[PDB]
Design a protein around this motif. Structure first.
Motif, short mmCIF file in Angstrom:
data_model
loop_
_atom_site.label_atom_id
_atom_site.label_comp_id
_atom_site.label_asym_id
_atom_site.label_seq_id
_atom_site.Cartn_x
_atom_site.Cartn_y
_atom_site.Cartn_z
N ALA A 39 21.87 49.47 54.96
CA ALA A 39 21.72 48.43 53.91
C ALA A 39 22.28 48.92 52.57
O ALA A 39 22.81 48.11 51.81
CB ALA A 39 20.28 48.03 53.77
N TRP A 40 22.14 50.21 52.28
CA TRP A 40 22.21 50.72 50.88
C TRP A 40 23.54 50.39 50.20
O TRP A 40 23.53 50.11 49.00
CB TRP A 40 21.88 52.22 50.85
N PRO A 41 24.72 50.37 50.86
CA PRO A 41 25.96 50.02 50.16
C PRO A 41 26.00 48.55 49.71
O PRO A 41 26.84 48.21 48.90
CB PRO A 41 27.07 50.27 51.19
N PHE A 42 25.07 47.74 50.22
CA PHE A 42 25.03 46.27 50.01
C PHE A 42 23.83 45.86 49.16
O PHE A 42 23.65 44.67 48.93
CB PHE A 42 25.02 45.58 51.38
N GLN A 43 23.05 46.82 48.65
CA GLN A 43 21.77 46.51 47.96
C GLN A 43 21.99 46.24 46.47
O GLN A 43 21.01 45.94 45.78
CB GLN A 43 20.78 47.66 48.16
N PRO A 45 25.50 45.10 43.39
CA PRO A 45 26.92 44.86 43.19
C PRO A 45 27.72 46.16 43.29
O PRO A 45 27.21 47.21 42.92
CB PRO A 45 27.02 44.27 41.78
N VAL A 46 28.93 46.07 43.82
CA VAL A 46 29.89 47.21 43.84
C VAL A 46 30.11 47.63 42.38
O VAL A 46 30.57 46.80 41.58
CB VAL A 46 31.19 46.82 44.57
N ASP A 47 29.71 48.86 42.05
CA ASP A 47 29.95 49.47 40.72
C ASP A 47 31.34 50.12 40.79
O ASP A 47 31.44 51.30 41.17
CB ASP A 47 28.83 50.44 40.33
N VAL A 49 33.27 50.97 38.44
CA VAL A 49 33.35 52.08 37.44
C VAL A 49 32.87 53.38 38.10
O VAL A 49 33.65 54.35 38.12
CB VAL A 49 32.56 51.77 36.16
N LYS A 50 31.64 53.39 38.62
CA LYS A 50 31.01 54.59 39.24
C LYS A 50 31.83 55.06 40.45
O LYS A 50 31.94 56.28 40.64
CB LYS A 50 29.56 54.32 39.64
N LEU A 51 32.38 54.12 41.23
CA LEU A 51 33.12 54.42 42.49
C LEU A 51 34.63 54.54 42.23
O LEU A 51 35.36 54.88 43.18
CB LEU A 51 32.83 53.31 43.51
N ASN A 52 35.08 54.27 41.00
CA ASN A 52 36.50 54.38 40.56
C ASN A 52 37.38 53.51 41.47
O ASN A 52 38.28 54.06 42.13
CB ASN A 52 36.96 55.84 40.53
N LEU A 53 37.12 52.20 41.49
CA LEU A 53 37.84 51.20 42.31
C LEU A 53 38.48 50.16 41.39
O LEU A 53 38.00 49.03 41.31
CB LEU A 53 36.86 50.56 43.29
N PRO A 54 39.58 50.50 40.68
CA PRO A 54 40.21 49.59 39.72
C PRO A 54 40.66 48.24 40.29
O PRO A 54 40.74 47.29 39.52
CB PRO A 54 41.44 50.37 39.22
N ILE A 97 37.70 42.16 53.90
CA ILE A 97 39.06 41.89 53.34
C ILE A 97 39.47 43.04 52.39
O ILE A 97 40.68 43.24 52.25
CB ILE A 97 39.18 40.49 52.71
N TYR A 98 38.52 43.80 51.83
CA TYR A 98 38.81 44.91 50.87
C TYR A 98 38.98 46.25 51.60
O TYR A 98 39.92 47.00 51.26
CB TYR A 98 37.74 45.07 49.79
N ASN A 99 38.07 46.59 52.52
CA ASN A 99 38.00 47.93 53.16
C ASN A 99 38.84 47.96 54.43
O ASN A 99 38.97 46.91 55.08
CB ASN A 99 36.56 48.33 53.45
N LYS A 100 39.37 49.13 54.79
CA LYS A 100 40.24 49.30 55.98
C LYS A 100 39.38 49.13 57.23
O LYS A 100 38.24 49.60 57.26
CB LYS A 100 40.95 50.66 55.96
#
Ligand SMILES: CCOC(=O)CNC(=O)CN(Cc1ccc2nc(-c3cc(C)c(=O)n(C)c3)n(CC3CCOCC3)c2c1)C(=O)c1ccc(N=[N+]=N)cc1
Length: 127
Positions: A39-43, A45-47, A49-54, A97-100
């Motif tokens: 669950a934890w990656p979905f608990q 919003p995608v940060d 900034v913290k994950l460095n995903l421009p 649609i975002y992740n491989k």
């Protein structure tokens, strides 16, 4: 990689109304997915900034997460079950649609989605 404001989770001028389906979506669907080991990656919003995903919020036009869904259910934000089911579907679609296809996060999404769809198959009658 700037984060948008999180989706609204309270409607200050919507009446408080339970349904069998909304009780089921909180107490069965959300509760079961929330306690899952994946669950934890979905608990939240995608940060980006913290994950460095421009590119995350460039590719994902309609961000959604179970933190937002949980708050919406707790705050009785949803008028009906279908808005809530759409939010779960959007969250999963964003991941796919975002992740491989061969990513850990996609296997985690697939496990949660399997559980989600099984619970939705037993969604109570609209009443
Ligand atoms: C100096 C900067 O260092 C950092 O970046 C620090 N930030 C951190 O804390 C990052 N984390 C925790 C963390 C929290 C929530 C996340 N949510 C996601 C994520 C991403 C994407 C695109 C996405 O589509 N969705 C829907 C969610 N990710 C990415 C991962 C990528 C791999 O698969 C699992 C999701 C998350 C990462 C971890 O490093 C961390 C992860 C697992 C651990 N378990 N152990 N032992 C311990 C720690």
């Amino acid at each position: 990689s700037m984060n948008p404001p999180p989706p609204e989770t309270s409607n200050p001028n919507k009446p408080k109304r339970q349904t069998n389906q909304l009780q089921y979506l909180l107490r069965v669907v959300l509760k079961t997915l929330w306690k899952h080991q994946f669950a934890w990656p979905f608990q939240q919003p995608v940060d980006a900034v913290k994950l460095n995903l421009p590119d995350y919020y460039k590719i994902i036009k309609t961000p959604m997460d179970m933190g937002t869904i949980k708050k919406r259910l707790e705050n009785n934000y949803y008028w009906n079950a279908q808005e809530c089911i759409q939010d779960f579907n959007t969250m999963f679609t964003n991941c796919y649609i975002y992740n491989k296809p061969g990513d850990d996060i996609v296997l985690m999404a697939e496990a949660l989605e399997k559980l989600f769809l099984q619970k939705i198959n037993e969604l109570p009658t609209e009443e």
